[PDB]
Write a protein that binds this ligand. Sequence first.
Ligand SMILES: Nc1ncnc2c1ncn2[C@@H]1O[C@H](COP(=O)(O)O)[C@@H](O)[C@H]1O
Ligand code: NA
Length: 717
Amino acid sequence: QSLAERVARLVAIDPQAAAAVPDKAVAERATQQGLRLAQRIEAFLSGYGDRPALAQRAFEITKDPITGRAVATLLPKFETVSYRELLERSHAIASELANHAEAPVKAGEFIATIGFTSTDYTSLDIAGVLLGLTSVPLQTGATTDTLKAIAEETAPAVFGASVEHLDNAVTTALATPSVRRLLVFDYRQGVDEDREAVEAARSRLAEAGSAVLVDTLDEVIARGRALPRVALPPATDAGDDSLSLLIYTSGSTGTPKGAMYPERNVAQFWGGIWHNAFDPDVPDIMVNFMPLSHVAGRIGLMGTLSSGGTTYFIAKSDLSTFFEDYSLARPTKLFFVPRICEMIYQHYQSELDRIGAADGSPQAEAIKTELREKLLGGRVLTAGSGSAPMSPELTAFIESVLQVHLVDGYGSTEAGPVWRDRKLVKPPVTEHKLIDVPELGYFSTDSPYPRGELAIKTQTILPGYYKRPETTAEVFDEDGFYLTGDVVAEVAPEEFVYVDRRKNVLKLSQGEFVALSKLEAAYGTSPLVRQISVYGSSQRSYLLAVVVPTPEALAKYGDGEAVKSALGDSLQKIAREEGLQSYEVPRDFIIETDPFTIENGILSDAGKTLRPKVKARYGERLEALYAQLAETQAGELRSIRVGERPVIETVQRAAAALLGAVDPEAHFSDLGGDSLSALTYSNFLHEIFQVEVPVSVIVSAANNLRSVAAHIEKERS
Ligand SMILES: Nc1ncnc2c1ncn2[C@@H]1O[C@H](COP(=O)(O)O)[C@@H](O)[C@H]1O
Ligand code: NA
């Protein structure tokens, strides 16, 4: 019943879980007062000895008989790396980098890295801490213009990259004269495609006459194993105050700014105060799907290392192996972002259909049982979400599936953890207040509950944004409070509810900020667009916009669904051109034929669109668009019940229902879902056509919707 009883019962009957329980003595040695980060990390990892620390899906290599090329294919199991092995491989990397013949790194230099999350990436991250470097994890979805800007600002000496991202890593490195070495990780020896991507990087660097040196991570470790360990602690300038990490975020300004993490703040991920974001000693077996560059990726991964647990890494970056991985790893602790919860709920609606059951009926309850017991692996003891708000209906559903309480954890890159199930986390938060936002209509005198921007003093507050004292100042008031940008309602002494943002950047259900004003500037260059105001709700997974089209567009296409299609195609292409993410493409529009103007109240005296006025005039209609699609996605029930139409038409119509917007020639990617949309599409078509419809056939750039139909037809034969 209670958590402690549930834990005691799992450890009595499960040998794998029994072997993973935290050891109080290891945490006591590692977190002792005054101990430097590097040594803390060393004490956790050496302390947990031969336990399995990390697990990667196993694969096999076989010679393709048509092409001759050695290809890798996933196996239905995981292989593990021990705490001892992890520590030893990380030390090897530090030893090799400190001792390189020509470009030895020193403490305080920067290392930039682009990868997903993996055993290798984790090695490299730890090695940076051992050397006293400052790490700069870069977002795998950023454009090379953004990567170059961050690299120009931080001047890294070493750049690391997974094989998947190597080509963007070469482009950045060529524009960044400080880079002396390029390290290539997640490299599979004997796999032809990996070997070729490294050869092509070397050619590009050759052709440029670059002095940059390329090494695989394997080779670096091989070399380092033969060298003595570096001395801890490393020779940095400021002890605990030494700059260990930069987490780039766009929340406070709309473009990336480098949140400074000294070693004393990074230490909080390793068994420190971030324990309490979510909150009896539980064995920690976790599946990690979050990039290391996202503070949530680091919280999970280092939390599990620091508790002597095991992290199972999601097998593919697209997340297409999601259920397979959870069904194999069978975690005891779940952390979701709300988008994952939406996806599980969409699966549950799918299963209701397939067995033709309804509502809360007994066979509908059997679907929840198989989610909890089989698909999610049946050992979930605790669960949390965060990064974005969750509807009460989605929370109710997830909890009825898992049969455990779903903790809501609020915090940020800048502040650390701030609340747990409404209640301020003290420590580290020491004081708070609310600040009125009269332009949006929120005031501490509101009834029934005060509303305002949350402002806090907290022990885990960042010292600044790197090299950006102006941007730093904007987030601190004259009394020393950090300004979160988040509007909240207060419902009891020191209890809060997320309501809105003070400005023009917000989270969607994926947990990533979207900068409304940047998207507006990009989308405003469409020849069809006169004015555009982009709108989002943080409980949704996609955006909307209010568009005033040009007279020529309104004349050529009219003011209904066909101009919305025209606009979609135009925006989609801009998004492809400027490297925007799939979810930052508006899915549906309010077409306004009457322009925004000063007379209207929509434009200020200075000509600029006022967001609060857009909201006051179009907010209801925008919220209706969202509501109606969420109500209507049983249009799939009618797409399934046919059979009576050709393959392509079902393929089309299916893509249309899942991505809000069609045309036979489009690519599913262009159309603006996200990688979990293609998983859902894939199961849907598999159900109907009893054919395997893999995500890689659906997402690969050279495959449009006609290739998808074509694939299904060929498989059927
Ligand atoms: N549990 C939550 N509920 C609502 N919004 C959240 C929650 N957790 C994080 N956020 C939002 O995500 C931002 C932090 O983003 P990051 O800096 O990526 O951790 C916050 O300022 C909020 O806007
Ligand atoms: Na998001």
